[PDB]
């Protein structure tokens, strides 16, 4: 059953790859609460197939990283690339597309997050197993305030100049 | 889900992929699917199988091994190496051009865990965000049939590295 606007988001533990020194960190994997991770602020989270994709690496989170400066003068927090991958992957992705500062790589390599929000799908035709669907969703106190969900294997509403077009008062 | 593949088992089909990057006949570029079976037929293959792409003791020790004994192997007959892992082709091609594998060690994806599933070599790497993934373990295949078998016990790499395979060729 699908995650829908009003909702509170359900808590699920990811992982994030941290490269540089930093306190309350360790070097690599850091895992983290996505409850604890969004109490108090708003964040934008968009999900997509998995790194080093075509589609995903040249275009989602490529917009993201370009827009993550009028993301945050709009008031978003924070903003997140989740997909079902490991920590070490999404560690490499993220310094291959230079995103340290403006997006956080959060790696759900055990689809738990995907899952419970009910947004997996698929792809094992194509090699890759359960994988999430693409989207954008906007957090705010810790409920979903916009849901943008792709049909499969479409590109129209989870891109960040949609998500900015569509922030709220 | 299936019991575990035994010395003297034939090798199960399964689909895998390898991203292949230049122009080649009967390819495509970036990831091609093709069948296990067909693929280790008529072959001598060592396919080693580990938990991850670009994780610590993979990457560091457990492919360069491989890497750094393909000619050795290959002189003593071996007619391919692959590294299985359940990770999709984009990843491991990426993986692949990291650690110079090219021409020694085919990058052969089981992203679905479809290989390592009929192998009944999966385990759980929940706990550390990775899902399901692969045991570490290596196997020398002939005639479409396992003829040594390596699998590590969880977290252990002393049977599997490409100096132990080298070591347990027979005649």
Same mark, same amino acid.
């Given at each position: 059953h699908m995650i829908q606007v009003g909702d509170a988001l359900p808590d699920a533990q990811l992982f994030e790859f941290i490269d540089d020194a930093r306190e309350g960190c360790t070097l690599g994997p850091n895992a983290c609460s996505v409850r604890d991770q969004v109490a108090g602020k708003r964040?934008?989270?968009?999900?997509? /197939?998995?790194?080093?994709? /075509?589609?995903?690496?040249?275009? %989602?989170? /490529?917009?993201?990283?370009e827009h993550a400066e009028q993301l945050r003068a709009a008031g978003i927090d924070e903003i997140?690339?989740?997909?079902?991958?490991?920590?070490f992957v999404m560690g490499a992705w993220g310094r291959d597309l230079h995103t340290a500062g403006k997006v956080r790589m959060m790696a759900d390599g055990s689809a738990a997050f995907? %899952?419970?929000?009910?947004?997996?799908?698929?792809?094992?035709?194509?090699?890759?197993?359960?994988?999430?669907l693409r989207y954008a969703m906007v957090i705010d106190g810790g409920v979903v305030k916009t849901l943008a969900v792709e049909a499969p294997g479409k590109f129209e509403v989870s891109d960040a100049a949609s998500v900015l077009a569509t922030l709220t008062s």
């Open positions: 964040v934008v989270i968009f999900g997509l /197939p998995g790194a080093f994709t /075509p589609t995903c690496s040249a275009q %989602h989170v /490529p917009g993201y990283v997140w690339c989740v997909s079902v991958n490991d920590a995907t %899952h419970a929000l009910g947004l997996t799908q698929d792809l094992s035709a194509r090699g890759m197993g359960i994988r999430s």
